[PDB]
Design a protein around this ligand. Structure first.
Ligand SMILES: *[C@@H]1O[C@H](CO)[C@@H](O[C@@H]2O[C@H](CO)[C@@H](O[C@@H]3O[C@H](CO[C@H]4O[C@H](CO)[C@@H](O)[C@H](O)[C@@H]4O)[C@@H](O)[C@H](O[C@H]4O[C@H](CO)[C@@H](O)[C@H](O)[C@@H]4O)[C@@H]3O)[C@H](O)[C@H]2NC(C)=O)[C@H](O)[C@H]1NC(C)=O
Ligand SMILES: *[C@@H]1O[C@H](CO)[C@@H](O[C@@H]2O[C@H](CO)[C@@H](O[C@@H]3O[C@H](CO[C@H]4O[C@H](CO)[C@@H](O)[C@H](O)[C@@H]4O)[C@@H](O)[C@H](O[C@H]4O[C@H](CO)[C@@H](O)[C@H](O)[C@@H]4O)[C@@H]3O)[C@H](O)[C@H]2NC(C)=O)[C@H](O)[C@H]1NC(C)=O
Ligand SMILES: *[C@@H]1O[C@H](CO)[C@@H](O[C@@H]2O[C@H](CO)[C@@H](O[C@@H]3O[C@H](CO)[C@@H](O)[C@H](O)[C@@H]3O)[C@H](O)[C@H]2NC(C)=O)[C@H](O)[C@H]1NC(C)=O
Ligand SMILES: *[C@@H]1O[C@H](CO)[C@@H](O[C@@H]2O[C@H](CO)[C@@H](O[C@@H]3O[C@H](CO)[C@@H](O)[C@H](O)[C@@H]3O)[C@H](O)[C@H]2NC(C)=O)[C@H](O)[C@H]1NC(C)=O
Ligand SMILES: *[C@@H]1O[C@H](CO)[C@@H](O[C@@H]2O[C@H](CO)[C@@H](O)[C@H](O)[C@H]2NC(C)=O)[C@H](O)[C@H]1NC(C)=O
Ligand SMILES: *[C@@H]1O[C@H](CO)[C@@H](O)[C@H](O)[C@H]1NC(C)=O
Ligand SMILES: *[C@@H]1O[C@H](CO)[C@@H](O)[C@H](O)[C@H]1NC(C)=O
Ligand SMILES: *[C@@H]1O[C@H](CO)[C@@H](O)[C@H](O)[C@H]1NC(C)=O
Ligand SMILES: OC[C@H]1O[C@H](O)[C@@H](O)[C@@H](O)[C@@H]1O
Ligand SMILES: OC[C@H]1O[C@H](O)[C@@H](O)[C@@H](O)[C@@H]1O
Lengths: 465, 166, 166
């Protein structure tokens, strides 16, 4: 017989196919071509077009799609559309397998849904375990979407028990305009930032943080999204910046590294964009979780062969007779995939047991620096040390602003011919100290003067210098 | 039945076949988002009475909300914190959307001297005593309880028994 | 308790006679009494307790019966005087028969006495056996008394028959 796995995807008008849509098409063709998994069922897709956040049409296509009869409906990747189809699938018995995080309210009495994006009750614990490891005190959470507070719940709280000085800021609705925000972070000394965005807006927020000179070794970033490896970090590979994140897309096994490599070839027909900071042809996370969405229900239909696809009706509330059994086999699956272990939680169809791999920005790109289980905490690796090991050109590619004062043995204007500009307008002892410090460290330097005239002393009634 | 977004969509289509002029739709956000998506697609006005988090990508024209915007009230509470000269507060909210309802008060330490210490009630009702005992210790004198009035009465019954009505 | 300032709040006129050796105590020790007296009414203790909150009367030696020892603490809760600052010594022997359920988590440290020998199983059985014909009549719930316990006035009349029976 033939199963009829459904699915809702946003189509770009004349943009070829959605990235999640390309996964769900190709992951069905993987099961049909490899008869090791499901040798006798031959799955079939029913992909429909859905407008950006239109909950009626997501209710309209799905009631049309349950008239065709499906065995599962793969979710609308939005939030207002997903809350609709979750309630269609609950009232008619069909499972509703989700791929992205919606705001789950505390009181939906629904059973027929599983989320495959990992829960932010566990992610916001994994952010704070990075904060506790780095021994920060001045965290500067920057979100972009209004539900980013929900995503960082356990980090917005705990200045209570874990003594922080959290300061919360929001990117405006001018989406590529983090310039007025980053001007307010350069002043006020916000060097420890927990940018909570998508990787599209995590790319363009770094190009605006490079041109402002906020990409020096003073700064440290703990980007929240599970897509940090899909950024072109080559402009930032040699700047000395700390840049920490996560990765759930397992890129370690020779098995799963082929699937990314196989379908980077396949979505090469899908044309890229200009230099928007992100690398081309990466199965980011959304096509990875939709890939795992096909398999975990495919290991559920394997353990339950007596299935049909009943042509259900929206008007009559006759539940799909196989529904309660087929939902219980989805929630009791453990089938491994791209994003690691895909075990579910009971008492809610979420994913609170998963395997993150903490990544960092080093001189060789983005490298794994540890791992994180929800019941094993943050297992960081041991650098264990190397050596200083020829400090001679460690500060190469740098640029430093040096401030001096005229002092006749140490700094004097070079009293000579026609006007000397740049660094040649100074001479003395500690100017000649820079000339043999820039030799032994290899940086560039611009001697500014002070504007005040002074050397530094505390104001008695104010405290400033 | 609220907490059910598909019965909210069927009874809306039953009224629109019956010929209503305006749906005064339900209270909960999972149901009211489904009703205004119907009321947008069929022209008919939806008139809301409760707070609902409008996603900023809902390009939707046919809804009005008579519940006052928490853009305004979280600037109203931030005025009272400054009128009372406070320097340390404790936002005790109730359910997960309380962080969304109080954005302009949580974003306030970025611009003022105010120093928030955000907390959250449990799923239960009379289990607020392990929370209030953790507020007595640590000297949490100034509290910005974000609850409904059903649970605003419930906390003060525990806050009396903890000896926190001083 | 290392006290240096108390406030004897007695109930009727003979409370001065009942507490001679505590009123005569500033003559010999460092203790500094500030004797007060409840009104003729019951719920009129709030003008007294408001005059004790002002003046910082932290340490109180209420001399009342247990009927009015429950009545003051109901006003002393409503005045916000059940805190971790305040400390009450009750002179009655029926302290153990008060409803301390709304006062247990307050932070208060109510001290008193108890002459009932409620450790021995012989004594504890007679208190149980007496409760059967006492629960035949219902009490009022608003009083604030844990019903079923055997009061000191009932206990001494039980002992008065036996000490003559011996
Ligand atoms: C970016 O990534 C780099 C590495 O990739 C991280 O580097 C760390 O740099 C900091 C300093 O900038 C090191 O900080 C440690 O601080 C500890 C606190 O104790 C000192 O604190 C006061 C000031 O508050 C000092 O005045 C005083 O001297 C105290 O000692 C220390 O315990 C650390 O000392 C360590 O080194 C000495 C020898 O130097 C040894 O005895 C011990 O190994 C000791 O642990 C140190 O001073 C931190 O060690 C660096 N981590 C590394 C190299 O892994 C950055 O954190 C990261 N982020 C940013 C924003 O740059
Ligand atoms: C900022 O300053 C840094 C140095 O401080 C410069 O960054 C790179 O530094 C690395 C190592 O320090 C260099 O990497 C080596 O490159 C060799 C080939 O050279 C380059 O050739 C062309 C240019 O002609 C480039 O297109 C190409 O990408 C290469 O980078 C490789 O042979 C080396 O590989 C192996 O070397 C040894 C010996 O086998 C092994 O032990 C190593 O493990 C390694 O596998 C090595 O990769 C590199 O040359 C530097 N420059 C780059 C990448 O441009 C930056 O240049 C400087 N910033 C700017 C903007 O210039
Ligand atoms: C299914 O989901 C529930 C709801 O999240 C899980 O319960 C949660 O379990 C975690 C541990 O995995 C607990 O979190 C606690 O965090 C604090 C802060 O660090 C720590 O002090 C505690 O020791 C504990 O780690 C907590 O019991 C609970 N969290 C809730 C209810 O918010 C449950 O574990 C999941 N089932 C699984 C994964 O099998
Ligand atoms: C956190 O760190 C690692 C994450 O990989 C966990 O596994 C441990 O990995 C090290 C490798 O450096 C193992 O050490 C050696 O492994 C080899 C190969 O098996 C073995 O032959 C050696 O005798 C030596 O043990 C280590 O055993 C391994 N731990 C295990 C398997 O339990 C590590 O367990 C994590 N947890 C902790 C608490 O460190
Ligand atoms: C009521 O109880 C508390 C704690 O049980 C006591 O006050 C503190 O605890 C010890 C034990 O008596 C004292 O030695 C400390 O000096 C007390 N702390 C302070 C800061 O004074 C005490 O038994 C009672 N306290 C009150 C205020 O009634
Ligand atoms: C079929 O899929 C299974 C499960 O991933 C894998 O072990 C096997 O190698 C695959 N076979 C082929 C021929 O691709
Ligand atoms: C499933 O496939 C096996 C062959 O691997 C076959 O024996 C069996 O009949 C199939 N089940 C069906 C067709 O229901
Ligand atoms: C180490 O430092 C010396 C100092 O000038 C430098 O000449 C040399 O190239 C460096 N590297 C090695 C491998 O010696
Ligand atoms: O895993 C969630 C959380 O559980 C517990 C704590 O001890 C942490 O170490 C850990 O992060
Ligand atoms: O101590 C507070 C802590 O105790 C227990 C855990 O299960 C958590 O849910 C809770 O936050």
């Amino acid at each position: 017989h033939v199963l009829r796995f459904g699915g809702i995807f946003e189509y770009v008008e004349s943009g070829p196919m959605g990235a999640e849509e390309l996964a769900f098409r190709f992951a069905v063709n993987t099961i049909n071509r490899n008869r090791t998994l499901l040798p006798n069922t031959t799955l079939t897709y029913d992909t429909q077009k859905i407008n950006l956040y239109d909950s009626f049409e997501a209710s309209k296509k799905a009631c049309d799609q349950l008239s065709l009869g499906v065995a599962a409906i793969f979710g609308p990747s939005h939030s207002s559309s997903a809350n609709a189809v979750q309630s269609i699938c609950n009232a008619l018995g069909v499972p509703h397998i989700q791929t992205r995080w919606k705001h789950q309210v505390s009181d939906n009495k629904d059973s027929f849904y599983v989320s495959l994006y990992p829960d932010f009750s566990s992610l916001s614990r994994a952010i704070l375990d990075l904060v506790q490891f780095f021994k920060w005190k001045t965290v500067t959470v920057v979100y972009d979407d209004s539900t980013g507070l929900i995503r960082l719940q356990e980090l917005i709280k705990a200045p209570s028990r874990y003594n922080l000085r959290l300061k919360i800021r929001q990117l405006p609705a001018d989406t590529k305009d983090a310039k007025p925000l980053l001007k307010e972070m350069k002043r006020g000394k916000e060097f420890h930032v927990i940018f909570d965005c998508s990787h599209e807006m995590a790319a363009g927020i770094l190009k605006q943080a490079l041109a402002m000179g906020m990409m020096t070794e003073y700064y440290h970033y703990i980007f929240t999204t599970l897509d940090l490896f899909a950024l072109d970090v080559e402009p930032y590979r040699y700047s000395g910046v700390n840049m920490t994140g996560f990765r759930i897309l397992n890129t370690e096994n020779t098995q799963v590294s082929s699937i990314i490599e196989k379908w980077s070839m396949e979505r090469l027909q899908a044309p890229p964009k200009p230099d928007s900071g992100l690398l081309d042809g990466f199965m980011t996370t959304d096509a990875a979780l939709m890939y795992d969405a096909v398999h975990v229900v495919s290991v559920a239909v394997q353990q339950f062969p007596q299935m049909t696809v009943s042509s259900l009706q929206c008007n009559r509330h006759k539940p799909w007779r196989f529904g309660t059994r087929f939902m219980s086999l989805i929630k009791e699956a453990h089938w491994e995939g791209l994003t690691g272990r895909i075990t579910f939680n009971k008492t809610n169809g979420l994913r609170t047991d998963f395997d993150l791999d903490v990544i960092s920005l080093k001189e060789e790109g983005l490298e794994k620096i540890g791992t994180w289980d929800p019941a094993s905490g943050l297992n960081m690796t041991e650098s264990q040390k190397g050596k200083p090991a020829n400090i001679t050109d460690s500060l190469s590619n740098r640029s430093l602003i040096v401030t001096t004062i005229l002092e006749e043995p140490y700094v004097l204007f070079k009293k000579s011919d026609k006007p000397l500009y740049g660094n040649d307008r100074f001479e003395g002892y500690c100017i000649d100290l820079l000339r043999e410090l820039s030799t032994i460290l290899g940086f560039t330097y611009e001697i500014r003067l002070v504007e005040d005239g002074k050397y530094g002393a505390q104001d008695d009634v104010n405290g400033q210098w």
